[PDB]
Amino acid sequence: IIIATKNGKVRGMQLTVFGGTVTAFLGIPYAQPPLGRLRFKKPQSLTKWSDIWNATKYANSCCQNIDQSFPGFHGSEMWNPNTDLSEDCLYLNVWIPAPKPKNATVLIWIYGGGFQTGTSSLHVYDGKFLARVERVIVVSMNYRVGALGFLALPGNPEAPGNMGLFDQQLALQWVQKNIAAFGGNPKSVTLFGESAGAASVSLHLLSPGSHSLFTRAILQSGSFNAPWAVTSLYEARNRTLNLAKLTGCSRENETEIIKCLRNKDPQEILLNEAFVVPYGTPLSVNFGPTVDGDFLTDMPDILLELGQFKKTQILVGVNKDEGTAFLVYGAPGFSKDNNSIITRKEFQEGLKIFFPGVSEFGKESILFHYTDWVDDQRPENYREALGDVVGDYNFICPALEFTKKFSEWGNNAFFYYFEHRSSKLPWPEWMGVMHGYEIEFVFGLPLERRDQYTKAEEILSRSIVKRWANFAKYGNPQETQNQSTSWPVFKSTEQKYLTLNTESTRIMTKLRAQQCRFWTSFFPKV
Numbered sequence: 001i002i003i004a005t006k007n008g009k010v011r012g013m014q015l016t017v018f019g020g021t022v023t024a025f026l027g028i029p030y031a032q033p034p035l036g037r038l039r040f041k042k043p044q045s046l047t048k049w050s051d052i053w054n055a056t057k058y059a060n061s062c063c064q065n066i067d068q069s070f071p072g073f074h075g076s077e078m079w080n081p082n083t084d085l086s087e088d089c090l091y092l093n094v095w096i097p098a099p100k101p102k103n104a105t106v107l108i109w110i111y112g113g114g115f116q117t118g119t120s121s122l123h124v125y126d127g128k129f130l131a132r133v134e135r136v137i138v139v140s141m142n143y144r145v146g147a148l149g150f151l152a153l154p155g156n157p158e159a160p161g162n163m164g165l166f167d168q169q170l171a172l173q174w175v176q177k178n179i180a181a182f183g184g185n186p187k188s189v190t191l192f193g194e195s196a197g198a199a200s201v202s203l204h205l206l207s208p209g210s211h212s213l214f215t216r217a218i219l220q221s222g223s224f225n226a227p228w229a230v231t232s233l234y235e236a237r238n239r240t241l242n243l244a245k246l247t248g249c250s251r252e253n254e255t256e257i258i259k260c261l262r263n264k265d266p267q268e269i270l271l272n273e274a275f276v277v278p279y280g281t282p283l284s285v286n287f288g289p290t291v292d293g294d295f296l297t298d299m300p301d302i303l304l305e306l307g308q309f310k311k312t313q314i315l316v317g318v319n320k321d322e323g324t325a326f327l328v329y330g331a332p333g334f335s336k337d338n339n340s341i342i343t344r345k346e347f348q349e350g351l352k353i354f355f356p357g358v359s360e361f362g363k364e365s366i367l368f369h370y371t372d373w374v375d376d377q378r379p380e381n382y383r384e385a386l387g388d389v390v391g392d393y394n395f396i397c398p399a400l401e402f403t404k405k406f407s408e409w410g411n412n413a414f415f416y417y418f419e420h421r422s423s424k425l426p427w428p429e430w431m432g433v434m435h436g437y438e439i440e441f442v443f444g445l446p447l448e449r450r451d452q453y454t455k456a457e458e459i460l461s462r463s464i465v466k467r468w469a470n471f472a473k474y475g476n477p478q479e480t481q482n483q484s485t486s487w488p489v490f491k492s493t494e495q496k497y498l499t500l501n502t503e504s505t506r507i508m509t510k511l512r513a514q515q516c517r518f519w520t521s522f523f524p525k526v
């Protein structure tokens with residue numbers, strides 16, 4: 001099966017899915033390899049080819065440091081790249097239903113990874129089930145991460161910042177110019193992403209250069225107003241200079257610094273990335289989105305507050321235990337191999353790990369609002385409090401605040417609270433419904449009966465897949481046929497949200513109200 005794209009023909013491959021067929025084009029290039037003098041620059045247009053490009057395997061993932069904290073453990077290594085790392089990584093993937101659709105809605109996945117890691121080839125991002133089950137086209141792309149994607153000298157085109165966001169954007173541009181050749185409808189494109197991918201999706205809502213490249217947006221556990229999502233001008237400068245010094249590229253002409261960094265092997269850049277910050281945390285984003293004056297014209301909190309974003313529908317949600325995954329990457333007393341009962345003193349120590357630059361008073365204020373218990377004799381009180389601190393501050397409260405502020409400008413928004421813990425979750429039970437572990441349900445992995453998911457999980461994934469496809473196609477994430485709970489729009493007044501679980505799917509109001517008032521109204525002052 002051959003498709004003629006604007007830059008040349010590509011050959012895909014047939015996939016057997018659920019007694020049917022999906023056509024996969026894995027690894028289509030969408031930009032000139034950003035090598036040599038193109039390292040740190042915006043992605044350049046692709047020179048046409050006349051051959052038949054073989055898009056029959058995932059391409060290189062972008063250079064990145066690997067999570068080595070739990071070698072051999074599926075819970076962590078399932079997020080590590082599964083193809084060769086290379087600077088030659090600007091490729092995308094296309095899953096089209098078979099028989100070829102005539103005008104299918106397109107879903108474009110943007111992976112997360114703290115803007116430092118990630119790849120579109122992960123097993124949990126496999127789009128073949130969505131193409132099979134919902135007859136949508138699924139697209140995903142690799143975009144540059146870390147310093148190679150987000151090194152910033154604002155205004156300098158040799159390293160302007162936000163290159164990995166421009167990679168994503170050039171990929172959306174490719175879909176606009178090419179997806180009709182695949183049976184896709186360029187006028188019906190939904191972006192969806194998780195974590196940094198969701199923060200990226202929300203930044204495309206703000207970026208005028210992306211306005212015309214998609215229709216709607218889904219944001220899973222992330223948004224640009226999360227405290228880790230946007231690097232300020234002061235930090236980005238200090239971090240660029242610190243990388244220069246660590247590598248021996250300190251110059252006075254900033255363009256000469258970039259030339260010097262261009263001769264460094266990718267590995268040398270990657271090993272010094274960790275140390276450009278004096279006090280890191282498990283949530284550090286050393287090199288991420290910045291206000292560059294190109295992709296992002298102003299501080300995005302101002303743009304959100306003042307209604308300067310694409311007017312469209314959004315689907316936003318978070319997981320019940322967003323915070324716990326980060327606790328075993330540094331908080332004292334925590335371990336994935338025991339139940340991590342921690343003491344008051346260990347809790348206080350954990351706050352220093354997660355809020356290193358925060359004053360004594362600020363850390364006391366966190367402790368005060370999170371450690372007023374009903375039964376102060378529950379041994380896991382402090383363990384659960386620290387997970388909630390990290391999850392509320394980094395994910396849940398920013399997602400709610402984004403959704404309130406976005407919906408105040410007239411658009412339908414839908415908010416979900418995902419609270420099913422996967423029966424196949426390799427992490428221990430105390431970590432709960434972890435960050436990232438809704439993704440496999442969104443992509444329909446539990447629809448594969450040959451896997452070890454329960455029947456309740458197949459049904460839950462089936463409903464979520466239908467709701468996501470209905471949102472993409474029609475702007476309304478309902479399941480209209482199986483007597484499902486109707487999903488009400490989220491309004492800034494009543495703030496209704498839908499819970500997603502195997503048992504009872506419920507309409508609730510004002511998620512984490514007391515906690516988010518602390519983080520959203522108080523904590524920014526300290």
Ligand SMILES: *[C@@H]1O[C@H](CO[C@@H]2O[C@@H](C)[C@@H](O)[C@@H](O)[C@@H]2O)[C@@H](O[C@@H]2O[C@H](CO)[C@@H](O)[C@H](O)[C@H]2NC(C)=O)[C@H](O)[C@H]1NC(C)=O
Pocket residue numbers: 102103185187188215473
């Ligand atoms: C494919 O369908 C589009 C319409 O898509 C719908 O409308 C969009 C605005 C958006 O809401 C999507 O989610 C919907 O699915 C057809 O678009 C028409 O195209 C012609 C020619 O370009 C144009 O004159 C009309 O104005 C378009 N109608 C619109 C914009 O509403 C398009 O023709 C279909 N293409 C194929 C090949 O089937």
Ligand SMILES: *[C@@H]1O[C@H](CO[C@@H]2O[C@@H](C)[C@@H](O)[C@@H](O)[C@@H]2O)[C@@H](O[C@@H]2O[C@H](CO)[C@@H](O)[C@H](O)[C@H]2NC(C)=O)[C@H](O)[C@H]1NC(C)=O
Pocket residue numbers: 238241242243245246275276277278
């Ligand atoms: C801005 O950067 C300076 C320099 O960072 C140091 O050098 C880098 C190459 C890298 O190795 C970092 O880990 C180093 O810390 C920071 O100043 C340092 O701050 C720490 C702790 O605050 C202190 O112990 C060091 O002695 C400082 N070194 C110097 C030369 O001042 C500074 O903190 C950074 N600013 C911010 C806001 O983070």
Ligand SMILES: *[C@@H]1O[C@H](CO[C@@H]2O[C@@H](C)[C@@H](O)[C@@H](O)[C@@H]2O)[C@@H](O[C@@H]2O[C@H](CO)[C@@H](O)[C@H](O)[C@H]2NC(C)=O)[C@H](O)[C@H]1NC(C)=O
Pocket residue numbers: 331332333334335337338339340341
């Ligand atoms: C849970 O485990 C942590 C981490 O300890 C490591 O992993 C364990 C599963 C086990 O294999 C240990 O050998 C490892 O050290 C425990 O925290 C440690 O506690 C010891 C007590 O001797 C202390 O000296 C260390 O500093 C701690 N390690 C840290 C803070 O990283 C914790 O006590 C265990 N909790 C429970 C309830 O079993």
Ligand SMILES: C#CCN1CC[C@@H](CN(CCOC)C(=O)c2ccc3ccccc3c2)C1
Pocket residue numbers: 079112113114117195196228281282283284285325326329435436
């Ligand atoms: C460092 C570190 C360890 N973490 C702990 C948990 C785990 C989170 N995963 C894995 C992918 O699950 C979606 C990330 O990729 C990741 C890494 C850093 C982030 C920084 C800010 C916001 C989100 C982040 C997400 C990796």
Ligand SMILES: *[C@@H]1O[C@H](CO[C@@H]2O[C@@H](C)[C@@H](O)[C@@H](O)[C@@H]2O)[C@@H](O)[C@H](O)[C@H]1NC(C)=O
Pocket residue numbers: 011054
């Ligand atoms: C690109 O692929 C071409 C065809 O691939 C081969 O033939 C098809 C029908 C399948 O059987 C497939 O698995 C086979 O590999 C090759 O002829 C051609 O050389 C390839 N181009 C390369 C490798 O640069």
Ligand SMILES: *[C@@H]1O[C@H](CO)[C@@H](O)[C@H](O)[C@H]1NC(C)=O
Pocket residue numbers: 253254255256
């Ligand atoms: C820095 O170097 C560049 C490239 O060689 C040059 O164009 C630019 O003018 C230089 N700037 C200064 C201040 O010397």
Ligand SMILES: *[C@@H]1O[C@H](CO)[C@@H](O)[C@H](O)[C@H]1NC(C)=O
Pocket residue numbers: 462463466479481482
């Ligand atoms: C609705 O229920 C039937 C079983 O009665 C099932 O086959 C079908 O796929 C369900 N659809 C969705 C979208 O959940």
Ligand SMILES: [Cl-]
Pocket residue numbers: 517518522
């Ligand atoms: Cl308060």
